């Protein structure tokens, strides 16, 4: 699937251009199609909250916890693999975002310290065991739902929550349990 990887590289390029005080025009990223730029735009709009793809980027927040933008994706993949994800699967997910162990990510910083310490200290995640796995934290259970995280998890690599039968059923049951 070279075109998804192409959109990912274009997204990395647009992120580098956005963080630094550098402009972003179509001809600039042409040499470095419409499906690929639309994919880069969807990735920027969902993972980082960057709307427009000469272009002009407009953001959403990013009392600002920009790195916490990573949280709902993670809570998604954990919910995708039942309710607990292997650390290897988590790192595989972090890779397509461009975040690598011991690497200073452009926005997240070093990802291991952020996801096994910060998000754990904040009760958003749990990181337990010589193999480790990630699970939802109590803050996650309190501040979002299985249905909202399923909506997010489907919005990328999917379309609707109904495409996941068992997951949509579990989110319905979770909504019924919460209403009590």
């Amino acid at each position: 699937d070279p075109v998804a990887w192409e959109a990912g590289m274009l997204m990395h390029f647009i992120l580098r251009k956005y963080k630094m005080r550098e402009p972003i025009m179509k001809a600039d990223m042409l040499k470095v199609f419409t499906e690929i730029l639309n994919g880069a735009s969807r990735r920027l709009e969902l993972v980082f909250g960057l709307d427009l793809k000469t272009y002009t980027l407009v953001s959403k927040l990013n009392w600002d916890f920009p790195r916490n933008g990573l949280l709902m994706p993670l809570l998604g993949v954990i919910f995708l693999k039942g309710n607990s994800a292997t650390e290897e699967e988590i790192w595989k997910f972090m890779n397509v975002l461009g975040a690598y162990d011991g690497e200073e990510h452009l926005i997240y910083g070093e990802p291991r310290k952020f996801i096994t310490q910060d998000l754990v200290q904040e009760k958003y995640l749990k990181y337990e065991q010589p193999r480790y796995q990630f699970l939802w934290g109590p803050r996650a259970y309190a501040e979002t739902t299985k249905m909202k995280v399923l909506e997010f998890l489907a919005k990328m690599n999917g379309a609707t929550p109904r495409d996941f039968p068992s997951h949509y059923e579990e989110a319905l049951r979770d909504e019924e349990e919460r209403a009590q």
Partner: nanobody, 120 residues
């Protein structure tokens, strides 16, 4: 339009109790998960507690307060409550009330806060 108004702060002797309230207007209070944060003198913002929407049956607390603070909500009054028992001087801080955003890990609205001072 939207407003979160915290109230109930003041001086309190250690080991005593105090109820903080947060009145919410301009949005559907019952829809948002709510949180209490606090900022101590010369320290950063610290998450205190969180409670879910749609029944409020899921509470979460920091370890510093787990056995002593109690978050609750009245949807009919659009009000959030933080009951603080067995208070300690560490608990001296400005306390803020904040509505959790749909993108979990961020927040849409926050109040102006109320000062809680624990000293004998």
């Amino acid at each position: 339009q939207v407003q979160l108004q915290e109230s109930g702060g003041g001086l309190v002797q250690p080991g005593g109790s105090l109820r903080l309230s947060c009145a919410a207007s301009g949005f559907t209070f019952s829809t948002y998960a709510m949180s209490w944060f606090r900022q101590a003198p010369g320290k950063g913002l610290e998450w205190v507690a969180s409670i879910n929407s749609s029944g409020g049956g899921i509470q979460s607390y920091a370890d510093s307060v787990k056995g002593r603070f109690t978050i609750s909500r009245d949807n009919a009054k659009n009000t959030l409550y933080l009951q603080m028992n067995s208070l300690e001087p560490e608990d001296t801080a400005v306390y803020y009330c904040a509505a959790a955003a749909w993108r979990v890990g961020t927040y849409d609205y926050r109040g102006q806060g109320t000062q809680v001072t624990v000293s004998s």
